[PDB]
Write a protein that binds this ligand. Structure first.
Ligand SMILES: [Mg+2]
Ligand SMILES: [Mg+2]
Ligand SMILES: [Mg+2]
Ligand SMILES: [Mg+2]
Ligand SMILES: [Mg+2]
Ligand SMILES: [Mg+2]
Ligand SMILES: [Mg+2]
Ligand SMILES: [Mg+2]
Lengths: 52, 88, 117, 104, 63
RNA sequence: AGUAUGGGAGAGGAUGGUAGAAUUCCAGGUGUAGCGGUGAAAUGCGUAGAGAUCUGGAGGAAUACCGAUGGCGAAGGCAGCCAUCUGGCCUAAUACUGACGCUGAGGUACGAAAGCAUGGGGAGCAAACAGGAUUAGAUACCCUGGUAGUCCAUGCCGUAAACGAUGUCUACUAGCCGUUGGGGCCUUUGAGGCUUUAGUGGCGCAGCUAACGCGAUAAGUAGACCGCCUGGGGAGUACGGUC
């Protein structure tokens, strides 16, 4: 996962903007870790909202 | 930070036999080079205790290898210390 | 005198008290009501009954400005959170939406000590 | 030398001069030696949230392969250029040349 | 959040929907959590107790 | 036991930069009778315009969600993101040294929080302190404020229920179920099924145990070395010595 794949990044984010836990989705541990890093990078780059 | 080329150069300089990478001379030469290199890093990061632990580990291994070489043969030990510029 | 058609109701529900304020967009205040100022002083202050009392009083005060569609913003815990919106809807306003705007720090300041009670 | 990926947000008003600044950066990298592996301009975008009281931003992406001195120079250039808000520099291994998503 | 009213949505049903959305979000939980400062040791204790309890729940369901 | 080469995961350590939420404070816009707090009150704040709402500024500290009986580190302990310097670990096939090992009295290095010295910083919290309640008394538990400290830089201090209350290293002794990082094989409907290795958990045979319980992460069966114990108080105390 990269910070530029906004569609998949949004596929794991709740409406409020919070990251969805791995248990609910079934994603693996390493995949979840890279997903979180990519989401944080996108939030910094203002490609996805931090909150709200 | 030593590179693969630098380590290969040290190995070539101190190798007793062709493809020799485990001899005491080669091991001590590599450890001496690494210890000398890390002094610059430890000059600017004096509070890096976690890395200084590994540096001390390298020092202890070099001491043990030198003692073993000296025990087995004195001439090799003397030549090695002369080449590597080590007091003991 | 001034007439505004659109307004926003802020409901500061809390453990001890609830506060209702009507503000025209851009946040300029028009009317406001509180539970403490409408009786129920003491433990009664936190009940939703005081909340709906304050909500109706604030709405009746605000009707003078002729605003008929209302947006609702809610922050904080405490009883009377839904009683206020129920009273505002009963008064005759058209509630456009209800949103939660309660602040959440991302581990900022140290909270106070736990009470040994 | 190493591989770096640079994302730059430029103020929308000064989007006209972006071609010049990027050209200067490429010229400096080539003068040092370096390698320009990737380059795109995503255009102007609606910010997810305001940055410095602005709601729009021009977006530029680069993959470069240069040395420490050149990297440091790029850093203070980005820092001091007021047209550049929100620069980001990621480290990478290997050079990626494939066209990126969000290109257009 | 952002519970936009429909053309004919009753106020009571809208309030019910808002309650359900807030409950799903869990906003009230954070406000309750931050009311007082809890010690790190107590935090680890709670998390370990929760770990044990959910492992026991999973074992009971599997059985 | 160690060395060279290819890959992998990680809040391992040091330095610098930077992002968003929130508390406090300072101004201004609207608006005018309360706010705050408790079991109930009161102290306190506010008509000299508080609280609420909006806008613009100053500064300090910590990083929601991800987050996990998860991960890393000898221990203490490590959490936003980016760059630089840097230590260890895991994994595969080759190629080398040839016992180069284990433990360790003295000695030395590191070592939570509080505390000490110099300079800076100071939002929030808060020992001491002040007032308000409760009480027969209240040196407290509750409430309103609040200093040192908590923060940064350079040193000292050597202490914790610093705990798994279980010293380090080594070989062997039924099984069943999870999970983290790798290797290998087989299916296809794109992810799965079997193995094996190094960690981390839940049961359990034999064996052990006063009992509780442990049980391949032993407190079982054996070897090497070190530290420690000899009824409860007096006492980790006095004297002498070192720091
Ligand atoms: Mg309190
Ligand atoms: Mg520092
Ligand atoms: Mg000793
Ligand atoms: Mg020390
Ligand atoms: Mg002791
Ligand atoms: Mg501990
Ligand atoms: Mg002990
Ligand atoms: Mg003594």
């Amino acid at each position: 996962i990269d910070y530029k794949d906004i569609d998949t990044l949004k596929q794991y984010i709740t409406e409020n903007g919070k990251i969805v836990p791995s248990r609910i989705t079934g994603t693996k541990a390493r995949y979840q870790r890279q997903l979180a890093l990519a989401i944080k990078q996108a939030r910094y780059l203002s490609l996805i909202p931090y909150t709200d | 930070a030593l590179t693969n080329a630098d380590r290969a150069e040290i190995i070539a300089k101190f190798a007793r036999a062709e493809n020799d990478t485990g001899s005491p001379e080669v091991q001590v030469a590599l450890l001496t080079a690494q210890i000398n290199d890390l002094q610059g890093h430890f000059k600017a990061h004096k509070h890096d205790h976690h890395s200084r632990r590994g540096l001390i580990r390298m020092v202890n291994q070099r001491r043990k290898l030198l003692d073993y070489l000296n025990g087995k043969d004195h001439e090799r030990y003397t030549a090695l210390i002369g080449a590597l510029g080590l007091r003991r | 005198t001034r007439t505004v058609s659109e307004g926003v109701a802020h409901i500061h529900a809390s453990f001890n008290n609830t506060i209702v304020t009507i503000t025209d967009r851009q946040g300029n205040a028009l009317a406001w009501a509180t539970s403490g100022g409408q009786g129920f002083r003491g433990s009664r202050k936190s009940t939703p009954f005081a909340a709906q009392v304050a909500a109706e009083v604030a709405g009746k005060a605000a009707l003078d400005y002729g605003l008929k569609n209302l947006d609702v913003l809610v922050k904080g815990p405490g009883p009377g959170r839904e009683s206020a919106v129920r009273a505002l809807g009963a008064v005759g306003y058209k509630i456009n939406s209800i949103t939660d705007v309660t602040p959440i720090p991302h581990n900022g300041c140290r909270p106070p000590k736990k009470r040994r009670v | 030398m190493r591989h770096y990926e640079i994302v730059l947000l430029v103020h929308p008003d000064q989007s006209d001069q972006v071609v010049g600044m990027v050209e200067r950066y490429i010229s400096q990298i080539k003068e040092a030696d370096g390698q320009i592996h990737r380059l795109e301009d995503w255009g102007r975008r609606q910010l997810a949230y305001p940055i410095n009281k602005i709601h729009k931003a021009h977006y530029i992406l680069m993959n470069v392969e240069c040395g420490q001195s050149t990297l440091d120079e790029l850093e203070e250039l980005f820092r001091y250029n007021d047209a550049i808000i929100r620069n980001l520099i990621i480290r990478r291994e290997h050079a990626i040349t494939e066209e990126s998503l969000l290109a257009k | 959040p952002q519970v936009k009213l429909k053309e004919g949505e009753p106020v009571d049903v809208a309030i019910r929907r808002f309650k359900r959305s807030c409950e799903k979000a869990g906003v009230l939980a954070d406000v309750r959590k931050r009311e007082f400062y809890e010690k790190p040791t107590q935090e680890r204790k709670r998390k370990k107790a929760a770990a044990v309890k959910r492992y026991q729940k999973k074992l009971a369901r599997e059985s």
